[PDB]
Structure 1
Amino acid sequence: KPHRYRPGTVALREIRRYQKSTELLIRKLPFQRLVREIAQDFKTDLRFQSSAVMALQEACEAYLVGLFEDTNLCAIHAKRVTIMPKDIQLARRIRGERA
């Protein structure tokens, strides 16, 4: 009974699954730590409201999901199904997030 889905088939399931849901996809503490880590470099011994870390996550993730959407199109524009660094750089170059 050695049952295996072929490559790409759970990926699709996942795509369906997560587009359908709203919960945040990055684990919260690690995120929190990252915020705090980055915070330090500007001003030491800061604090955060929990709600300000959540606004930051909601924003970052949304940023990222969106960037992926555009990345995915850039993949497909080069007749690929697999997103690659260069796709992201094009997405951002066109958006004007970098030169």
Structure 2
Amino acid sequence: HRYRPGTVALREIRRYQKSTELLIRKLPFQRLVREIAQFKTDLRFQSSAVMALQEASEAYLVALFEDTNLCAIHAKRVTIMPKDIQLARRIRGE
């Protein structure tokens, strides 16, 4: 048995819009932050700082992807493409 392409996609869309948990794994994100924080060598961090960074990053990515989807739909496409992101960031003023 197989679910037709896109059905499980909608199922995931629903379930992940219902849920409120984080999507990015904490350890990779912490390693990324502590790597790109090397600005000032030998730094120390409060955990809440990394949690707020993760929250803000996931929120920003979600907000960006929403406009990406809007653009792709405007282009009469289902699949999003990098040009859609570029257009979104161009109009957004970045």
Q: Calculate percent identity across the aligned residue pairs.
A: 98
Give the C-alpha shift of residue 77 in structure 1.
0.5
> Where has structure 1 moved over 4 Å in runs of 4 or more?
none
Give the C-alpha shift of residue 91 in structure 1.
0.6
Q: TM-score, normalised by structure 2?
A: 0.97
Give the C-alpha shift of residue 80 in structure 1.
0.4
Distance 1:14 1:83 in 2: 17
Give the C-alpha shift of residue 17 in structure 1.
0.6
5+ long unaligned stretches in structure 2: none
Q: Deviations over 1:35-92 (max 9, x none)?
A: 111111x111111100000000000000001100000000001000111100000110
Match of 1:18 in 2: 16
Distance 2:64 2:10 in 1: 19
Match of 2:56 in 1: 59
- State the secondary structure of the residue aligned to 2:37: helix
Q: TM-score, normalised by structure 1?
A: 0.92
Distance 2:65 2:3 in 1: 25
Match of 1:73 in 2: 70
- State the secondary structure of the residue aligned to 2:24: coil
Q: Deviations over 1:13-54 (max 9, x none)?
A: 0110111111110001101111111111x1111111000000
5+ long unaligned stretches in structure 1: none
Give the C-alpha shift of residue 6 in structure 1.
1.0
Structure of greater relative contact order (alpha carbons < 8 Å, 6+ residues apart): 2
Count how many residue pairs are aligned between Structure 1 and Structure 2.
94
Distance 1:36 1:55 in 2: 14
